[PDB]
């Protein structure tokens, strides 16, 4: 019925899945063994899990996902973790070599001999699939191995399936932090590949995750654990409509139809308000007005950009927990008559409202508080142009000095694709400033 | 300013090898290394 399929590529895409299921087991209460208790749900596989798991006759819930990596280390690690029985062994596909962060290396040298297996697995899931709304894809623009494989297999599956949406959740490059010098290269390669075939691509950056972590969570030694925990909670929030019931419902189809204005520009942002520490929530108050004020607070976003320097296109806000439309509409009207937020003269409204009764849940041993009213914020803005405006004037320099290019040319590519990515990016910006202009 | 510094060091050093004492070996033992070269070269 209302089910989707998950894919992870590159070694950046594996911790995040690991955490996503470490959570996703809990809201239906499935032990690492994989069995609902004797409470009467087991059978052919119909109940709210159905969107996530296919628990067949043996009573074992089955993730509808694929984890493909190119180095056996982490895949065998998780195969030796607790959840090895939970996962399907060959749904964890392992390669033997690294992409060297060389996009073309990963896209032509090795990409030809695993795509067959992965697409065959996709078919043998899509057969049993019923609703097949689409896919949730995890890669990384700083793809250590994710980039080229993602581009190639995404092109193949895009041409093979032309009747559904595609969601991409990418960790965007850290603007002033780099663990890789080939990062600008493979980042822009992936961009000018994907922008024409991603249906909804969302960005997130990790420096700002840390910044939030030591602003309001009050913790000074966080890690991947907390990072991925909150990110997984975000994706849980955006799938809660499919997960549970409520007053009224929303769906990714509506997200597409109303959020993205036009063709091409489909690069929105996400935001979460009630990330608060235990003591801080203990003797303070939370409600709709303040959570909305804190969400539109500019620094609480997870991309280093200034909406005050930007101009707004669209906004979809999802409330999870218990609320009333009275306060909903009152507060959103207050924000509508707020002053700093420069909405374009185009859109008189910009607000897609969704509600669900079931509150978000905790992870055992985690860090977030015991919240009753959560909210997720998706937004089309013109403020993101700064990231590309920064990237281009680094890449032009490092390419006019054309260091490291020997790698790529000796493995087969040449400067033409780089040159083309240049003007693809240029067209991106050029569209953005003019749509921002009244 | 750094040029002033180094030049004053040079004029300071040279005018001290006229004294009637002092002999061959010490001169050579300081020739290559008068002051560790490192003219602070924007030190940090």
């Amino acid at each position: 019925m209302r089910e989707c399929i998950s894919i992870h590529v590159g070694q950046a895409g594996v911790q995040i899945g690991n955490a996503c299921w470490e959570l996703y087991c809990l809201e239906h209460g499935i032990q690492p063994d994989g069995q609902m208790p004797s409470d009467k749900t087991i059978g052919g596989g119909d109940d709210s899990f159905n969107t996530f798991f296919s628990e067949t006759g043996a009573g074992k819930h089955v993730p509808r996902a694929v984890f493909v990596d190119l180095e056996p280390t982490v895949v065998d690690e998780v195969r030796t973790g607790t959840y090895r029985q939970l996962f399907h062994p060959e749904q964890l596909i392992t390669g033997k070599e690294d992409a060297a962060n060389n996009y073309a290396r990963g896209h032509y040298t090795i990409g030809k001999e695993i795509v067959d297996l992965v697409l065959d697995r996709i078919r043998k899931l899509a057969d049993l699939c019923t609703g097949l709304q689409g896919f949730l894809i995890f890669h990384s623009f700083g793809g250590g191995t994710g980039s080229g494989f993602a581009s190639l297999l995404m092109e193949r599956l895009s041409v093979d399936y032309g009747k559904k949406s595609k969601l991409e959740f990418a960790i965007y490059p850290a603007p002033q932090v780099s663990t890789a010098v080939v990062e600008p290269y493979n980042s822009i390669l992936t961009t000018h590949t994907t922008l024409e075939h991603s249906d909804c691509a969302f960005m997130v950056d990790n420096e700002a995750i840390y910044d939030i972590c030591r602003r309001n969570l009050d913790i000074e030694r966080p890690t991947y654990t907390n990072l991925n925990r909150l990110i997984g909670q975000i994706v849980s929030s955006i799938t809660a409509s499919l997960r549970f019931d409520g007053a009224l419902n929303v769906d990714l189809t509506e997200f597409q139809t109303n959020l993205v204005p036009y063709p091409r520009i489909h690069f929105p942002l996400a935001t979460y308000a009630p990330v608060i520490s235990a003591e801080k929530a203990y003797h303070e108050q939370l409600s709709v007005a303040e959570i909305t004020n804190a969400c539109f607070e500019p620094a609480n976003q997870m991309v280093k950009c200034d909406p005050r320097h930007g101009k707004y296109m669209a906004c979809c806000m999802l409330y999870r927990g218990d609320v009333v439309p009275k306060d909903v509409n009152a507060a959103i009207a207050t924000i509508k008559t707020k002053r700093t937020i420069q909405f374009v003269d185009w859109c008189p409204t910009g607000f897609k409202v969704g509600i669900n009764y079931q509150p978000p849940t905790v992870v055992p041993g985690g860090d977030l508080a015991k919240v009753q009213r959560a909210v997720c914020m998706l937004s089309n803005t013109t403020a993101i142009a700064e990231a590309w405006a920064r990237l281009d004037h680094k890449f032009d320099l490092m390419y006019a000095k054309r260091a490291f290019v020997h790698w790529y040319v000796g493995e087969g590519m040449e400067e033409g694709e780089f040159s083309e990515a240049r003007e693809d990016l240029a067209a991106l910006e050029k569209d953005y400033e003019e749509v921002g202009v009244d | 300013k750094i040029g002033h510094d180094v030049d004053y060091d040079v004029v300071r050093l040279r005018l001290r090898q006229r004294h009637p004492h002092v002999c061959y070996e010490q001169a050579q033992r300081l020739v290559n290394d008068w002051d560790p070269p490192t003219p602070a070269r924007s030190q940090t």
Partner: protein, 427 residues
């Protein structure tokens, strides 16, 4: 899976391999006999990255060892670990060499290259999927250079996809006992610059300076020197065999590391060296870890990076750390001297982190860098060559061997290209 086959050359290599293998052995936790001891498992599962299995839970080295001097082999055989080696592989020669470079590269190797090649290719077929080779040898030493240039020239063509790491020892900038050592250096480097992909270059003087500054311990052993370098090898190879993210392929590093084909040589560095008593006078914290880590005295390979500027750096860390402290430390130092870097490229740091430390110390790190500081060494040697070749004394031995000076001519301008190109980019 991914595996490595180790090559050992020259009289340096004799003890280098001894120290290095015993380090990795007692790291994974194997008895001197060779029977497994299970305390940590991940080491056991990943031992196949280097070792070959022998029945009854015994784990033979994938080493191939060669020299021409037999006494070094006998001493290694007698050492407290040499029994772990296998008598199958001790290919050797039938006389000495006098570590003349021309002899070492042309006459003697002719009859031994076949045997060494057959042994190594049997090993290569046996293993599954090779990242590449690592050689422990000398560039200033004679017989190691003579055999090693031959073998490295031989192997590249068959295996032109593979990581041909070369790890050597550089002559002293002050005194080297061996006198035709210059000519050894020039002839070795002439092939090595074209043929290798990565080469680590280290020198003894700074080891002695390290002994005085931090060891403080009066009377060392060359064994202890080899320990101080085996730490660097252990570090640089940690990441492959252990879990916790860091994309660890030395090629994953190298493409990130070197900008141009004629830039292969690098300058190592170790992490906390604690004095006689500072063990409880130091707060073992990441900030001061990095403080000592990137220093003018912690460095020990060739010379101070002060004289020039850096192109690229790579730091590996081993221990229960987090992103933040290392990331913001790098930003702090980047601000501290945003000048001695190259505006050529921003963010010229590579960082890698693995969670399972070595034993004895909780936090650890290893440094490697590519900076504009090789000109010191290669200038020095270039003027030495011009001075010596001015009246070409002692070149009669090479004339007898059949060496003639046109090879000197071809090499010297290659080093001229090296110096000019290094200075050219950064200035």
């Amino acid at each position: 899976m991914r595996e490595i086959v180790h090559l050992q050359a020259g009289q340096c290599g004799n003890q280098i391999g001894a120290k290095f293998w015993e380090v990795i052995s007692d790291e994974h936790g194997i008895d001197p006999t060779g029977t497994y001891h299970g305390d940590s498992d991940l080491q056991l599962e990943r031992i196949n990255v280097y070792y070959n299995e022998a029945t009854g839970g015994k784990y033979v080295p994938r080493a191939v060892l060669v020299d021409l001097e037999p006494g070094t082999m006998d001493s290694v055989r007698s050492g407290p670990f040499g029994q772990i080696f296998r008598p199958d592989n001790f290919v050797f020669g039938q006389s000495g060499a006098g570590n003349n470079w021309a002899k070492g590269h042309y006459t003697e190797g002719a009859e031994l290259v076949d045997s060494v090649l057959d042994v190594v290719r049997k090993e290569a077929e046996s293993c599954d999927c090779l990242q590449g080779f690592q050689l422990t040898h000398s560039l200033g030493g004679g017989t190691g250079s003579g055999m090693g240039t031959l073998l490295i020239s031989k192997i590249r063509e068959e295996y032109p996809d593979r990581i041909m790491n070369t790890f050597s020892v550089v002559p002293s900038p002050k005194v080297s006992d061996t006198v035709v050592e210059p000519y050894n250096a020039t002839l070795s480097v002439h092939q090595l610059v074209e043929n290798t992909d990565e080469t680590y270059c280290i020198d003894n003087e700074a080891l002695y300076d390290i002994c005085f500054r931090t060891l403080k311990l009066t009377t060392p052993t060359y064994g202890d020197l080899n320990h101080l370098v085996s730490a660097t090898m252990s570090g640089v190879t940690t990441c492959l065999r252990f879990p916790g993210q860091l994309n660890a392929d030395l090629r994953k590093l190298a493409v990130n590391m070197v900008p141009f084909p004629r830039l292969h040589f690098f300058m190592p560095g170790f992490a906390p060296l604690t004095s006689r008593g500072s063990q409880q006078y130091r707060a073992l914290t990441v900030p001061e870890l990095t403080q000592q880590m990137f220093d003018a005295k912690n460095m020990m390979a060739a010379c101070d990076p002060r004289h020039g500027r850096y192109l690229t750096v790579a730091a590996v860390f081993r221990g229960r750390m987090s992103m933040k402290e290392v990331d913001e430390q790098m930003l702090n130092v980047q601000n501290k001297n945003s000048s001695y870097f190259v505006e050529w490229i921003p963010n010229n740091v590579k960082t890698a982190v693995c969670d399972i430390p070595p034993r004895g110390l909780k936090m650890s790190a290893t440094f490697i860098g590519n900076s504009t500081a090789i000109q010191e060494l290669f200038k020095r040697i270039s003027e030495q060559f011009t001075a010596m070749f001015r009246r070409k004394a002692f070149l009669h031995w090479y004339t007898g061997e059949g060496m003639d000076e046109m090879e000197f001519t071809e090499a010297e301008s290659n080093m001229n290209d090296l110096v000019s190109e290094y200075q050219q980019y950064q200035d």
